[PDB]
Amino acid sequence: TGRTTIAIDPVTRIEGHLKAEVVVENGKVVDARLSGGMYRGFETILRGRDPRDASQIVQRICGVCPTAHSTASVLALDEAFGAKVPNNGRITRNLIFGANYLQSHILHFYHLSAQDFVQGPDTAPFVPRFPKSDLRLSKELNKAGVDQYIEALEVRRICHEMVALFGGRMPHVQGQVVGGATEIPTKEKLVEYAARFKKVRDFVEQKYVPVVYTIGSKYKDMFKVGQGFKAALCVGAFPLDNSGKKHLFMPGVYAKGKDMPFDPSKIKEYVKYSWFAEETTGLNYKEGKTIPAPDKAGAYSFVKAPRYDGLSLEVGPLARMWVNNPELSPVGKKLLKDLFGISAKKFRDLGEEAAFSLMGRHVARAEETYYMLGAIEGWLKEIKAGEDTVVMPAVPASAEGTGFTEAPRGSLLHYVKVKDSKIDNYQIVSASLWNCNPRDDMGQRGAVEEALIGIPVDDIQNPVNVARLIRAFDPXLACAVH
Amino acid sequence: RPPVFWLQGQGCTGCSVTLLNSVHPSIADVLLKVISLEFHPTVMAWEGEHAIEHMRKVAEKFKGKFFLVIEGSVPVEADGKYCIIGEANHHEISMVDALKEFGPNAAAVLAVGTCAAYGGIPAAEGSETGATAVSKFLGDNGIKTPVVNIPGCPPHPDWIVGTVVLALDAIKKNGLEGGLAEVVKVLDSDGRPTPFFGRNIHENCPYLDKYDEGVMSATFTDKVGCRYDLGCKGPMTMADCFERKWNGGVNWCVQNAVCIGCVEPDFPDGKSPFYQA
Ligand code: SF4
Ligand code: SF4
Ligand code: FCO
Ligand SMILES: [Fe+2]
Ligand code: NI
Ligand SMILES: [S]
Ligand SMILES: [S]
User: Fold this and answer.
1) Residue A407 Cβ contacting ligand 7 at under 6 Å
2) How far apart are CA B75 and CA A159, in angstroms?
3) Fewest 10 Å CB contacts: which of A86, A190, A209, B49?
4) How far apart are CA A225 and CA A271, in angstroms?
5) Which CATH number covers residue A144?
6) Same structural domain, B190 and B221
7) Distance (Å, whole) CA A255 – CA B51
8) Is B71 annotated as a binding residue?
9) What is the CATH number of the domain that holds B83?
């Protein structure tokens, strides 16, 4: 057909400001560039402040995943301050943060992604859209999609009620601080959390997980594209004891068919193609620097380019479920057989090709939502009503700390250095930074840039699969740039 | 249902997410019965230059009659390059450009969140993007369109929806010009609607007796004493959280921890350090 450059700015039904530019040749994407177009500079804003302020300031990186930033920050502060979080505060934190995993995945599938496959009502903001939007569902299945989108608006709001029960409010919780959680769970509020959880759980098991497989079965071609590098990172999340050694998601790297441990010293952030001063390139986060250079020639994004031992990796539900390889949900296994003819027991039984695909990332996110149900149920049984959840540590004069966790969209770490009782440096390496970054100093593309290669564009006037692929990764450019 | 365009500058999407939490009317009812949300990057069906051109087509037809919501601050440094919001016909559109394009032609501009209202975290010490509040940017550029500030980081959904409804009800009682004048009349000196921001947190706080008696909690989890020594900024904060509470009434900041003064024009620097007085 020939060669066509397509620019999409803004990419919509993501969080934040993203431009995607692709080259299409003979009906397939042959090159891609992603541009994070908005910068705030939290890493410089935080300098000089009382370190305890960080766990409030950093949440404003992103109003979709603020609990993830709160968590990474308080973990970094806990280490820097030498604070021993009480066992019950560890569990309370997990209840605050876990509820937002449910909120974020449900928001992402229904309110961001589902319109890629479902025609909404004939009114804004569901119209106008591409004339040939490739919406394949039957009248009845499309109506189920719309009904569930509407119901999901209530379910995601209930998830935020769950967050706020012990977190104070949401977005931007008040309840996580260095040293634990600010509000001891009472019997009465645990009843309130559990009652809401029951409603969310039922929606996840009865509606959300089935609809992802069912829609997927009408878009089976979308399991054959979007593989990219087929390399994944998990840094670990949701401490399950007080020794720091067992987590709901265990850390690991997967690349070139091999599993290996995660060593955070192997992270470097490159900036050749990013709007930051050239001299700051290739730094590990412990020596990270943030010096904007919005006029720098050749750069195309405010997202830095993180690499793990030179590798371009992806993060998120697929990464975590691939690395950890849990059993698939009973309903997922049943629907894989009923609707795809696939016999599968563990997540990796999907195979690398189908797991690392456009539709495989949606499946992974639904399966992870199911997986989180059991974790939250466990925490509700483990918590002790009335047992103290916080200690009140002093600000250290000089210290450092690192918090590692998994935000809904992938691996997150905050590093803080304290000098003269104030923040000397604060560096964030976030989930969509791993996914939506530009080329590194070696010219190697970021994960989503690489996953766009091979995406079909049979109609350049209706190039719907470009943003469909991007949305599968649940991008959050506020997080990516900070 | 009047057309609404929701433009995001240097925002975190928290002002959009808080709106999705509206209890009554629900967000479904807001979108299908109250407003016509013609452009919103986070939720709308179309994308890219097509979404921008759709907004421009509506703006042309409804010049003077659409409502413009701004989430996030407007960065002016580096010729606007710290916030690019789209591209149409190979021309990039900065937040500066967009506000100069649509701002003059809106019925009114609703600056949602402390960033848009007052600069907020992107304008705070250590920033370098020239993050500017909506009303200041418009005034600096000679744009006289009425601005209503709905601050908070994030605002409560009821403040956003309630301000929309107040303006729409006022317009249907007195017409566009008359109704906008009624709205101006219920704004405080910081441009905030007095129904939501006219009362002080501390003067209405259930722990006021403890403050007056000098009984202060020394740990966050002690819920008996006043939170002042732990950093509560309620004495300096004008919002109705004490009554409405948050997220379906399940909690609020003073009960759970401390107020950080998130609706105030000096947030965060004049409200920080958060955990001391
Ligand atoms: S808790 Fe805060 S708002 Fe309430 S009386 Fe004490 S200082 Fe005032
Ligand atoms: S209680 Fe204070 S910090 Fe919380 S939402 Fe209200 S004004 Fe903002
Ligand atoms: N989830 C989430 Fe936000 C992103 N990307 C972080 O970290
Ligand atoms: Fe960073
Ligand atoms: Ni985010
Ligand atoms: S996010
Ligand atoms: S989160």
Assistant:
1) yes
2) 33
3) A190
4) 29
5) 1.10.645.10
6) no
7) 38
8) yes
9) 3.40.50.700
- The count of domains in chain B is 2
What is the interface size between A and B, counted as CB pairs within 8 Å? 266
Helix (H, G, I), strand (E, B) or coil at B164: helix
CATH number, residue B274: 4.10.480.10
Resolution of the solved structure (Å): 1.4
Chain B: give the shortest CA distance to residue A478, in Å: 6
Q: Cβ(A253)–Cβ(A260) under 8 Å?
A: yes
Domain final position from B196, B229, B251: B196
SS3 A429: strand
Inter-chain touch B121–A120, beta carbons under 8 Å: no
Q: DSSP for A238-252? A: EESSSSS--EEE--E
Task: Please tell me whether residues B202 and B183 are part of one structural domain.
Answer: no
Q: Residue A167 is nearest to which of B90, B218, B256, comparing CB atoms?
A: B256
Residues B174 and B213 in one domain: no
Q: How many CB atoms lie within 10 A of CB A427?
A: 24
B15 noted as active-site residue: yes
Q: Which residue, chain included where needed, has tokens 């998830």? A: A159
Range of the domain at B183: 1-196
| Residues of B in Cβ contact (< 8 Å) with A193 | none
Indicate which of A18, A39, A148 best probes the interface with B, i.e. most B CBs within 10 Å of its own CB: A39
- What whole-number distance in Å separates Cα of residue A299 and Cα of residue A292? 11
| Technique of determination | X-ray
Beta-bridged to residue A410, according to DSSP, are: A407
A479 near A432, Cβ under 8 Å?
Answer: yes
